[PDB]
């Protein structure tokens, strides 16, 4: 029942409840002449909500806020962007105008500024070096090292065993490398292994784009990334 790319008109946002107090948000965007889906996370935070990632642009993010109020009815009070690309920070200004406190690591904030992308307000401490983890409300933020980008964070919800990999993790249907312009292809498998070693208890794994699955999304991603490094597509 997870919504697929052809099931979400561009400009609309769907929510999917993964576990008690955990939802993903799903939006779509035109990119490279195709239409791509994109996931973020919503985590219940007492009587408030913690948002992970925007919905890829101002229009989608406004629709995300409206859909959250329609379906959940609790206020989004904080948001964390997991890397500097537009599918993660595009819409930060909308969140800020809606009273959401926006956060990213210093590295993400700097890279967003260099790229010309929206810059989250707050700087997350303690995520500078590969292997660093910090608790942030009801989630753990983890910097596994460079992968899809040098700044990419992953997010674990310990109460629900939900691992949100962001764009460092590919859905199973993705057979080839996606947007790797800013990626560290050489470190990506090592970074995935750090994720596997830290969260072997994860029951649900949410990629940055596409269908959730289990922990075999990690090995699938390593396989695809390694094939790309070797100028190969297998699947």
Residues of the shown chain interacting with Na ion in the complex, contacts defined by CB under 5 A:
46
Q: Which of 2, 6, 65, 62 lies closest to 36, judged by CA?
A: 6
| Helix, strand or coil, per DSSP, at residue 104 | strand
> Among the options 60, 87, 152, 228, which is catalytic?
87
Q: Is 182 a catalytic residue?
A: no
The one segment of 23-31, 65-73, 99-107, 201-209 that binds Zn ion by CB under 5 A: 201-209
Q: Which residue reads 């269908």 in tokens? A: 211
Q: Which of 220, 180, 179 lies closest to 196, judged by CA?
A: 220
**Tokens standing for residue 73:** 């009815």
> Among the options 85, 117, 151, 228, which is catalytic?
85
> Could you say whether residue 208 binds Zn ion (CB under 5 A)?
yes
> Could you say whether residue 145 binds Zn ion (CB under 5 A)?
no
Which of 44/146 has CB closer to Zn ion? 146
Query: Do the Cβ atoms of 13 and 55 come closer than 8 Å?
Result: yes
Give least dist CB 83 to Zn ion, A.
Answer: 5
Q: Is 148 a catalytic residue?
A: yes
Residues numbered 120-139 forming contacts with Zn ion, rule: CB under 5 A: none
Residue choice 220, 221, 222, 225 for contact with Zn ion (CB under 5 A): 220
Residues numbered 158-187 forming contacts with Zn ion, rule: CB under 5 A: 167
Provide long-range contacts, Cβ within 8 A and 24+ apart, for 24-33.
24/164, 24/206, 24/212, 25/51, 25/55, 25/64, 25/67, 25/68, 26/2, 27/55, 27/56, 27/60, 27/63, 27/64, 28/56, 28/60, 29/56, 29/57, 29/60, 29/87, 31/179
- Residue 115 assigned as binding residue: no
The one segment of 44-52, 123-131, 208-216, 225-233 that binds Zn ion by CB under 5 A: 208-216
Q: Is 85 a catalytic residue?
A: yes
The one segment of 73-81, 92-100, 153-161, 206-214 that binds Zn ion by CB under 5 A: 206-214
**What track of x and - describes contact with Zn ion for positions 67 through 96 (by CB under 5 A)?**
------------------x-x---------
Q: Which of 115, 186, 111 lies closest to 145, judged by CA?
A: 186
Give least dist CB 174 to Zn ion, A.
Answer: 8
| Helix, strand or coil, per DSSP, at residue 5 | helix
Site residues (vs Zn ion, CB under 5 A): 85, 87, 167, 208, 220
């Amino acid at each position: 029942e997870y919504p697929t790319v052809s099931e979400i008109p561009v400009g609309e946002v769907r929510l999917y409840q993964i576990a008690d107090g955990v939802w993903s948000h799903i939006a779509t965007q035109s990119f490279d002449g195709a239409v791509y889906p994109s996931n973020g996370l919503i985590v219940r935070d007492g009587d408030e909500l913690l948002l992970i990632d925007t919905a890829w642009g101002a229009k989608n993010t406004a629709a995300l806020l409206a859909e959250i109020e329609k379906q959940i009815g609790l206020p989004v009070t904080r948001a964390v962007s997991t890397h500097f690309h537009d599918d993660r920070v595009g819409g930060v200004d909308v969140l800020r105008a809606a009273g959401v406190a926006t956060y990213a690591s210093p590295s993400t904030r700097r890279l967003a500024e260099v790229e010309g992308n929206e810059i989250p307000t707050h700087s997350l401490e303690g995520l500078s070096s590969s292997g660093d983890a910090v608790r942030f409300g009801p989630v753990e933020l983890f910097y596994p090292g460079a992968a899809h980008s040098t700044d990419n964070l992953v997010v674990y919800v310990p109460s629900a065993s939900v691992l949100y990999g962001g764009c460092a993790i590919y859905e199973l249907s993705r057979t080839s490398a996606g947007n790797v312009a800013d990626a560290d292809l050489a470190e990506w498998p090592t970074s995935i292994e750090r994720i596997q070693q830290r969260y072997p208890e994860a029951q649900f794994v949410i990629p940055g784009h596409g269908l959730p699955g289990g922990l075999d999304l990690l090995k699938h991603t390593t396989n695809v990334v390694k094939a790309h490094t070797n100028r190969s597509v297998v699947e």
